[PDB]
Amino acid sequence: ENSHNKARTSPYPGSKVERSQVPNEKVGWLVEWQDYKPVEYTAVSVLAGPRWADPQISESNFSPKFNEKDGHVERKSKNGLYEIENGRPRNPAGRTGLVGRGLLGRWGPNHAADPIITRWKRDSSGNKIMHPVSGKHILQFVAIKRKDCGEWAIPGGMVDPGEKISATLKREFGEEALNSLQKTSAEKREIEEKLHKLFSQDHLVIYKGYVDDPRNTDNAWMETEAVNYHDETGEIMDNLMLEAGDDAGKVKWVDINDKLKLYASHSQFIKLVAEKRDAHWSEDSEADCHAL
Ligand SMILES: O=P(O)(O)OCC1O[C@@H](O)[C@H](O)[C@@H]1O
Ligand SMILES: [Mg+2]
């Protein structure tokens, strides 16, 4: 019973555009609202028609195949089918008060991928560390500090046109967490060997689908695929130094626990990983709120 909230904040990112107000009871498309009048807005950068953006719906020869693989553009939503009304997609989470695409290049789902690389925290002797409160070992994951807003986050990113989610995962992690774009060539082989063995081991899909994002509109929204590549022994990430890509101010292994503050919905993803890996999570048991 919780409506998307970030997707209804104003002004729209990178603009002064104010979204039309949407009472929570009228978020669902199923709810009748004849007077609903969303503000129309698509960023100039998207309207300019770059290679990563779709044409406007009116463009004569533009015939998108929604809810399916449409060439080098994946139009399927990972939450199932989304409705087409008035020739364009309808946000599956509901009304947002704004039509058009805002800063999103694609009509409909705009896919991203979030590679969560984890390993157990280890001491000077290479042994795991148990937390006394949970009795579980502490897990860490590779996080980057965003240059634009300085928020810590999973090193993810947009799926490029024609790119496979698996490639986006490998590419985003390497480029921003290892800085593969600027590493002794050939030495890039090893990063590929290691990431290869790492991303070849069995991973876990943590989350797929809609992401409540301030860039979302009634017609275009963000979706992600968060996947966890875990290094159980530590052998793989062992000798792989983290180096920030040019899009990150910092990069480092971050201890996982319920106190973490991360970008977007990344902390929800981290909580799920700790659950699946049976890692420590509860920092404080508020025992003092009950004990004499
Ligand atoms: O931050 P950018 O790369 O611009 O958009 C990508 C992503 O934004 C979030 O919705 C997802 O979790 C994914 O990390
Ligand atoms: Mg990117």
Ligand SMILES: [Mg+2]
């Ligand atoms: Mg990014």
